[PDB]
Design a protein around this ligand. Structure first.
Ligand SMILES: *[C@H](C)[C@H]1/C(=C/c2[nH]c(/C=C3N=C(/C=C4\NC(=O)C(CC)=C4C)C(C)=C\3CCC(=O)O)c(CCC(=O)O)c2C)NC(=O)[C@@H]1C
Ligand SMILES: CCC1=C(C)/C(=C/C2=NC(=C\c3[nH]c(/C=C4\NC(=O)[C@H](C)[C@H]4CC)c(C)c3CCC(=O)O)/C(CCC(=O)O)=C2C)NC1=O
Ligand SMILES: CCC1=C(C)/C(=C/C2=NC(=C\c3[nH]c(/C=C4\NC(=O)[C@H](C)[C@H]4CC)c(C)c3CCC(=O)O)/C(CCC(=O)O)=C2C)NC1=O
Ligand SMILES: CCC1=C(C)/C(=C/C2=NC(=C\c3[nH]c(/C=C4\NC(=O)[C@H](C)[C@H]4CC)c(C)c3CCC(=O)O)/C(CCC(=O)O)=C2C)NC1=O
Ligand SMILES: CCC1=C(C)/C(=C/C2=NC(=C\c3[nH]c(/C=C4\NC(=O)[C@H](C)[C@H]4CC)c(C)c3CCC(=O)O)/C(CCC(=O)O)=C2C)NC1=O
Ligand SMILES: CCC1=C(C)/C(=C/C2=NC(=C\c3[nH]c(/C=C4\NC(=O)[C@H](C)[C@H]4CC)c(C)c3CCC(=O)O)/C(CCC(=O)O)=C2C)NC1=O
Ligand SMILES: CCC1=C(C)/C(=C/C2=NC(=C\c3[nH]c(/C=C4\NC(=O)[C@H](C)[C@H]4CC)c(C)c3CCC(=O)O)/C(CCC(=O)O)=C2C)NC1=O
Ligand SMILES: CCC1=C(C)/C(=C/C2=NC(=C\c3[nH]c(/C=C4\NC(=O)[C@H](C)[C@H]4CC)c(C)c3CCC(=O)O)/C(CCC(=O)O)=C2C)NC1=O
Lengths: 161, 172, 225, 160, 49, 162, 27, 160, 161, 161
């Protein structure tokens, strides 16, 4: 768990060197993008349940997975699916605020593949659900904030696949 | 401007099919009680003047400001105009119980009357007390039977109390 | 009986002099005395209809006033009086609006000007309920402003709506004041929602083909041999 | 079911099944024939139950079928009829099993979260199960209607 | 170990939570009461030896 | 909005006078009317479906070029005949409303005020609805006083159309 | 014909599309 | 306010207030005039905001004003506008507080439970506060609209 | 926690005797009431939410409590109020099933008085709400079981006051 | 836990009205005090250890308490005494910042009386130590904020006695 600042400090410390001009430039880049990160995080905190339910309405609804035999069939499985998608959106917001995806592979992508493979959860359908969540939130917060959200959404989909 | 017959007509048209049988029992008993209704209106109408002066006399006994100088109804044309307004409200509530619907009352006289009395500086609660006392005398004038065939005039006493109440609450 | 309230006038494009000149924003003026051919009666009758009823259909047209005016016994002032006391105006304008909005509309259409203030419509709303619509229209016609601006033989118009070197002058009052208001469309209950958005068909969501999909080459295989 | 619940309740307590629990299982085993008769009654006439209950629901709660209602546009009403069919199927499962752990353990745990994520009024769903209960207990004998109305009662109680 | 809300038909521990709101009970007995009732037993005691 | 009661109110209202004895007579004369009028409205509601079907039959038999010639106005295909059932059902329903209200005002307000431009722009010859109302006034089979009221009634419909 | 896509079959159990007829039939 | 929240943070961490949050309290102290202006303009035009937002909500979601819905009738629609009045009042309280905590204490703890009791659809209330947000930010200047929209955004986030 | 059966066994146990015929008389009284107790309990369990909402709509809604200035003003206090009412109804159903108000004295009225004094809860409004709930459940489930619920609701009110 | 702002909002909320001009008057009173409240809080936070050591050196040191026979004899009791004094000073600083003594009644004086009776802590020595600390912080941070700390220290003493 480290943001862009802590990773820059960790690189300069593992070097043992002081903060040179490249580290200063990286921190200036983060300190310019931080206000946009803050406003996108507020806008995403506004519409958590709406983004999640629009992602299910785009991908998972009216397909086979909500029908009998699907892994999203029962009300318990539906509630756990909404819970999993809320987790993905919340941690993508955290990784957007930090500017570093270390929290994603520390706390989402750690044992997620083995959990989903033990439960029988389809990984492709949940990857499509995360992609639709990314599409909806990029329609919500704009072009560049949607892109800096979608880089961590693509990180979650890549670590899941 | 709506009769209760064309209330049923316009509601069935906005529905868009024929008038049902239950509404036709209701309209038949409306026809059997409209006798009471129409000349209940005219009974209310005849002493309308004495009703108006008695309600105004009571109102200016209850509120001595309105005939005191500086009051709203103090000078002579303002007092005459107040009598005109009370006569108008009684006449329109009389029209409304003749149509059988409060649509003429809410449509013809009450609606802008609230804003008119506020913008003039006219008190509204005084008018409310006046129309309430006027309604009490109105049913009793229309309710007590003197030289009239015994009949079910009680139905009107209900609806005319409703009409006077809508008038007083819409004046406010 | 009781006279009117004295309401102070307010400033407007009418009570001012104005240095008018012949342009098109000036309404074409229609006068009984110089129309003397049969077609120009049709144009005058159409113009008075456009003012009083806003494009009266054949149901709304009164045969007697048009007939009698083409003969010429009727004055156009009396023709406008007959239009205002005719039942299609009473039905469309006096019924559906309250007394205050009716006086607003009738002052705009007879005198050709907006009323000065709300207290003017209030002061004129005594006379219509106490003395009838006929006495209201009669007292409106007898006032000197209608006579000085139009006279016996002139169809009224909106007076000095538009000033010189303006793109817009003013709303034409036929657009501004229609016969309904919000209060009586609420009684008719018109805004029933069109509801043609977000119907939510329940059929399964379409998924874009992934790279290397067999279908991707379906459309070219249909075109190929 | 009853046997699962008795086994688990003796299982946490580190004891065998008490004899009172054993005659409970025995009485449920004997009443299984009437349970299967109620299940055939509920299964064979599911079309009329779902149809009449949907009709009475949309008569009772017309706003969900009305413009702006969640169930709007033929498929929304029709889609709702599928959810009502799901709940009648779970009613049949709970009738056979002798307990509400099929109904609760399938379609009542996260029902609030699911129907809040869909945008659905849950009181109108409770009215749907109420009309289903009215049509179903109008279809049986007295004790059969009471035994089925117990599970219908549990579903409407678990809604609100 | 998870969010409790997709495992509860209704707000299930309102008695213990309301007792903790008065602090007639302590947090430790609230933890013990969370361990004792049936959701934890159907969660972590049933599918494991 | 022509019923006798609202016209009495409009007269008193236009005049500014209070309700009088002259206005009162209308109410108990609306008894001579209404005591059969509500009966006739109910029996028209019963007669209604066969009335529209027979009127469609009479209009198609009088004018075969409607069912033959292809066009938007003409009832060549199914949807044109559906529009015809809608139009004659509207006419019969306005007759029933006009009968219940007591005056022509519902019919004059809901049908008559725009029928000239609609028949002009949409190419609907009014002699079709002449045939339809004449078939209705022949087929309704009203008895006594109620029947007489309809003729005055349905003739006003034809006179507005012609 | 060897369709490369899923067979043309429809109306599987627990589908809303099967209950769309009964949705039309009710008020 | 921000001071109570900084105090309970320094209390749970059992230390004095850091100079960062002392500077936060000082910046809040200097920005008091801007928040007074925002709450002043909101307390000025509350009726117009409520009327336009309620008509926009009824135009968007007609389920609540339909027969069988929640807000059906004169008194029910008036109580709906009263609840919108309470929420705009709490919006002004949180705007002048600098924090969302009085909105939390007064009107955000059990709104799902109590609206589950009354039968009110909570997403309709979220749409109502959405329309109030759109109208109030349409009234304000853009920077002050961003500040008030933060608290409005928090309320609709805690709703849905 | 004692039933009618457990209270009979307890009373025969303190004095030390075996089961006498009068104890069997009380036991058969309990059984012949207990069949309709079961049906009334199922009816109350089916309709508990409507019972509570009708109780608060009868008495507490358009007063000063649900208004500002009362103890039922905020949504926190409203949710606590509905929860208090649900608990009164549930424990009254338990006391109706057991045939003994010892559960109401054991679990409900144990320390409810002093916390109601300390939080400032009005006792009179609660008593009115419970009595409104009493005749709501009496009109729901019937006359004799309405009396059954009546003495247990009255036991709760007497322990409260 | 309420500020001057939260108590104003609370009082306007119980009676049910909006913000009146007198509430704005109290709010501007709070702000114009709050600037110097911030500077005094920073000064107290800077010098808390010297303030506490001067308080105990003023009153408690050469008495029977820090001597044998007193409740401040052992190093355990001395460390508990210094911790009690540090907590009094910290909560007085919180009450000075909030402008309301509700925190002192909420967290300090909640059960402090009965544990001070039960452990045998002398109330009078504690009150003398708090008053010595009061004029120590008054001579440190100034006159008006000295009065600010004075009424909150007096609130602690009145809740203690
Ligand atoms: C019905 C009378 C009410 C109603 C229903 C309604 N349901 C949906 C959509 C879904 N419902 C479910 C429900 C379940 N799945 C289950 O496994 C179980 C337990 C057996 C239940 C209860 C699911 C998963 C969906 C999503 C689609 C799918 O079936 O896969 C809708 C559509 C919602 C939408 O946004 O389209 C509706 C309208 N709504 C009402 O108004 C009635 C009160
Ligand atoms: C914070 C990081 C983190 C994640 C992401 C996480 C996921 C996680 N998801 C789970 C279940 C689940 N996850 C899903 C989700 C899906 N299945 C589908 O069909 C859809 C394609 C997809 C949703 C989009 C479902 C249905 C279950 C329940 C499986 C079951 O109950 O059998 C479980 C099983 C235990 C439990 O439900 O509570 C875990 C631990 N845990 C974590 O700690
Ligand atoms: C068709 C329905 C209709 C109504 C109701 C109506 C009311 C009306 N009341 C008026 C005045 C008035 N109204 C009152 C009223 C009263 N005196 C009091 O003290 C009491 C508070 C109240 C008696 C109930 C008075 C005194 C005036 C005269 C004020 C003035 O003209 O200066 C005026 C101003 C014109 C004038 O009469 O001088 C109007 C237009 N007009 C309408 O067209
Ligand atoms: C315009 C000339 C005219 C008048 C005057 C008139 C009155 C009149 N009042 C009638 C009935 C009636 N009138 C009354 C009136 C009352 N009974 C009471 O006990 C009350 C105190 C009182 C009302 C306040 C009643 C109760 C009936 C019974 C019959 C009905 O409902 O019409 C009837 C029914 C038919 C009949 O009596 O032959 C007539 C004629 N009809 C007319 O054509
Ligand atoms: C209320 C009573 C009343 C009547 C009777 C009346 C008649 C009347 N008939 C007129 C014209 C007319 N009248 C006729 C008459 C006829 N055509 C013939 O060939 C026959 C000789 C005769 C048919 C009987 C014609 C052709 C005109 C049109 C002449 C024109 O407008 O140029 C005009 C001139 C306006 C116009 O219609 O263009 C009036 C005013 N006006 C009234 O207000
Ligand atoms: C309530 C009073 C009322 C009347 C009078 C009325 C007439 C009316 N008839 C129409 C169409 C029609 N009406 C007819 C009926 C006929 N045409 C023929 O050629 C046949 C002889 C006759 C069958 C009797 C047809 C065929 C159309 C179709 C026009 C089109 O599709 O463009 C339309 C166009 C509306 C639409 O597109 O559905 C109107 C407004 N509508 C009304 O709401
Ligand atoms: C400040 C925190 C706070 C909140 C939130 C609050 C809500 C609240 N909403 C109420 C009613 C209501 N609220 C609504 C509102 C709605 N239903 C709809 O249709 C609309 C979509 C939605 C409006 C956004 C309705 C319809 C009622 C009346 C419910 C009934 O009478 O059954 C009542 C009952 C009447 C009363 O005692 O004033 C309370 C207390 N009170 C509070 O003190
Ligand atoms: C199983 C037996 C049992 C009961 C009954 C019980 C009640 C109980 N009721 C409480 C509060 C409450 N109870 C009410 C009650 C009411 N609202 C009113 O104003 C009316 C007078 C009444 C509604 C009928 C209110 C308003 C509160 C919260 C007051 C507050 O702390 O803010 C609390 C404090 C914690 C909380 O907020 O819930 C407890 C522990 N606890 C138990 O273990």
């Amino acid at each position: 768990m480290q943001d862009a600042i802590t990773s820059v400090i960790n690189s300069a410390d593992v070097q043992g060197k002081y903060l040179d001009g490249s580290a200063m430039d990286k921190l200036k880049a983060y300190f310019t993008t931080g206000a946009l990160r803050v406003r996108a995080a507020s806008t995403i905190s506004a519409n958590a349940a709406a983004i999640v339910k629009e992602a299910v309405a785009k991908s998972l609804l009216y397909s086979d997975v909500t029908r009998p035999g699907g892994n999203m069939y029962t009300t318990r499985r539906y509630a756990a699916c909404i819970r999993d998608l809320d987790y993905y959106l919340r941690y993508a917001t955290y990784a957007m605020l930090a500017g570093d995806p270390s929290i994603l592979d520390e706390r989402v992508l750690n044992g997620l593949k083995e959990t989903y493979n033990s439960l029988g959860v389809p990984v492709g359908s949940t990857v499509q659900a995360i992609q639709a969540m990314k599409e909806v939130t990029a329609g919500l917060v704009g072009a560049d904030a949607g892109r800096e959200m979608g880089v961590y959404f693509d990180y979650i989909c890549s670590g899941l696949s | 401007m709506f009769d209760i017959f064309t209330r049923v007509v316009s509601q069935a048209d906005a529905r868009g099919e024929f008038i049902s049988s239950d509404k036709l029992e209701a309209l038949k008993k409306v026809v059997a009680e409209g006798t009471k209704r129409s000349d209940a209106v005219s009974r209310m109408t005849n002493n309308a003047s004495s009703i108006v002066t008695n309600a105004a006399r009571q109102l200016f006994a209850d509120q001595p400001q309105l005939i005191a100088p500086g009051g709203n109804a103090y000078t002579n044309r303002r007092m005459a105009a107040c009598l005109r307004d009370m006569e108008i409200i009684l006449r329109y509530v009389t029209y409304a119980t003749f149509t059988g619907d409060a649509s003429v009352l809410n449509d013809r006289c009450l609606n802008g009357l609230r804003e008119t009395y506020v913008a003039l500086g006219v008190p509204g609660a005084s008018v409310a007390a006046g129309v309430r006392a006027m309604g009490k005398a109105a049913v009793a004038i229309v309710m007590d039977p003197a030289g009239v065939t015994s009949g079910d005039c009680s139905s009107l006493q209900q609806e005319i109390e409703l009409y006077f109440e809508t008038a007083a609450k819409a004046v406010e | 009986t009781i006279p009117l309230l004295q309401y102070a006038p307010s400033s407007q494009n009418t009570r001012v002099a104005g240095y008018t000149v012949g342009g098109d924003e000036q309404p074409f003026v229609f006068t009984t005395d110089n129309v003397i051919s049969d077609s120009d009666f049709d144009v005058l009758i159409n113009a008075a209809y456009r003012q009083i009823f806003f494009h009266a259909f054949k149901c709304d047209r009164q045969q007697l006033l048009e007939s009698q005016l083409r003969n010429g016994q009727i004055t156009v002032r009396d023709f406008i009086r007959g239009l205002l006391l005719s039942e299609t105006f009473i039905d469309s304008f006096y019924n559906k609006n309250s007394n205050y909005r009716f006086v607003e509309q009738c002052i705009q259409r007879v005198l050709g000007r907006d009323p000065f203030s709300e207290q003017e419509k209030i002061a004129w709303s005594i006379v219509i309920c106490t003395k009838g619509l006929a006495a209201f229209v009669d007292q409106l016609l007898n006032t000197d402003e209608y006579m000085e601006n139009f006279g016996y033989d002139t169809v009224p118009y909106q007076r000095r709506r538009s000033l010189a070197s303006r793109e817009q002058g003013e709303i034409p009052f036929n657009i501004k004041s229609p016969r309904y208001d919000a209060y009586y469309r609420s009684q008719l209950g018109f805004p029933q929602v069109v509801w043609q958005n977000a119907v939510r068909r329940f059929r399964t969501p379409d998924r874009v083909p992934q790279a290397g999909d067999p279908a991707l080459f379906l459309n070219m295989a249909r075109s190929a041999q | 079911s009853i046997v699962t619940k008795s086994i688990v309740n003796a299982d946490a307590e580190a004891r065998y099944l008490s004899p009172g629990e054993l005659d409970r299982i025995k009485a449920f085993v004997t009443s299984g024939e009437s349970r299967l008769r109620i299940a055939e009654t509920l299964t064979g006439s599911r079309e009329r139950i779902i149809k009449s209950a949907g009709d009475a629901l949309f008569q009772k709660r017309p706003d969900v079928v009305s413009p702006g209602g969640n169930a709007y546009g033929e498929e929304m009403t029709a889609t709702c009829l599928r959810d009502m069919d799901y709940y009648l199927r779970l009613i049949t499962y709970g009738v056979v099993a002798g307990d509400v752990t099929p109904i609760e353990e399938i379609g009542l745990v996260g029902v609030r979260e699911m129907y809040k994520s869909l945008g659905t009024p849950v009181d109108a769903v409770a009215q749907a199960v109420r009309e289903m209960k009215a049509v179903a207990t109008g279809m049986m004998s007295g004790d059969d209607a009471a035994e089925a109305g117990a599970y219908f009662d549990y579903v409407i109680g678990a809604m609100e | 170990e998870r969010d409790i809300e997709p495992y509860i038909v209704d707000a299930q521990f309102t008695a213990l939570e309301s007792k903790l709101g008065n602090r007639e009970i302590n947090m430790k007995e609230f933890i013990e009461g969370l361990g004792c009732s049936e959701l934890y037993q159907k969660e972590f005691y049933t599918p494991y030896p | 909005m022509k019923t006798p009661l609202t016209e009495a109110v409009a007269l008193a209202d236009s005049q500014g006078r209070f309700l009088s004895n002259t206005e009162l007579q209308y109410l108990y004369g609306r008894l001579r009317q209404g005591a059969f009028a509500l009966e006739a409205a109910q029996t028209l509601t019963a007669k209604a479906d066969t009335l529209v079907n027979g009127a469609a039959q009479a209009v198609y038999s009088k004018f075969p070029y409607t069912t033959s010639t292809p066009g938007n106005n003409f009832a060549a295909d199914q949807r044109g005949k559906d529009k015809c059932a809608r139009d004659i059902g509207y006419y019969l329903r306005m007759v029933t409303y006009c009968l219940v209200a007591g005056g022509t005002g519902p019919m004059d307000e809901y049908l008559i005020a725009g029928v000239d431009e609609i028949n002009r722009t949409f190419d609907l010859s009014p002699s079709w609805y002449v045939e339809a109302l004449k078939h209705i006034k022949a087929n309704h089979g009203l008895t006594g006083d109620a029947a007489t009221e309809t003729n005055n009634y349905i003739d006003y419909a034809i006179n507005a159309l012609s």
